[PDB]
Amino acid sequence: ELNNLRMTYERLRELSLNLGNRMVPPVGNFMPDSILKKMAAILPMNDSAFATLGTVEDKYRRRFKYFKATIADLSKKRSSE
C-alpha cells in the first residue's frame, strides 16, 4: 500500500507551496488541486504527454516547467516503488 502516487500528490503539494512562496509576488495557488491529482497519476514527463491531463490552462502549462524536476523523478520512481 506504498502508493507512490500519494507520495507524488504530496510532493506536489509541498513543492507548490515551496516554489509558490519563492515567487515574487507569491502565487498562492502554484498548481490547482485538480491538476496536482491528474499530473500525479499520469506523471507526464513531456509536453506531448501533458495532453493526457485532459485540460491544463496555457497559464498552467507555463509554470509547469517548475514541476518538471519533480514529475520526472516520480514518473521514473513509479516503476521502482
Q: If residue 7 lies in a helix (H) or strand (E), which one and from where to where?
A: helix 4-21
For residue 68, what is its C-alpha cell? 518538471
Provide the domain count of the chain: 1
Under 8 Å between Cβ of 53 and 35? yes
Classify the C-alpha dihedral 46-23-59-41 as positive or negative. Answer: positive
CA distances from 1 to 7, 28, 29, 78 (A): 11, 31, 29, 13
How far is it, in rounded angstroms, from Cα 53 to Cα 56? Answer: 7
Q: How far is CA 6 from the centre of its chain?
A: 12
Q: ∠8-11-14 over CA atoms, to 5°? A: 150
CATH number at residue 64: 1.10.150.80
Q: ∠57-31-12 over CA atoms, to 5°? A: 135
Q: Which experiment gave this structure?
A: NMR
Under 8 Å between Cβ of 46 and 64? no
Domain, as residue range, for 78: 1-81
Q: Cell numbers 504527454 correspond to what residue? A: 49
How far is it, in rounded angstroms, from Cα 57 to Cα 45? Answer: 17
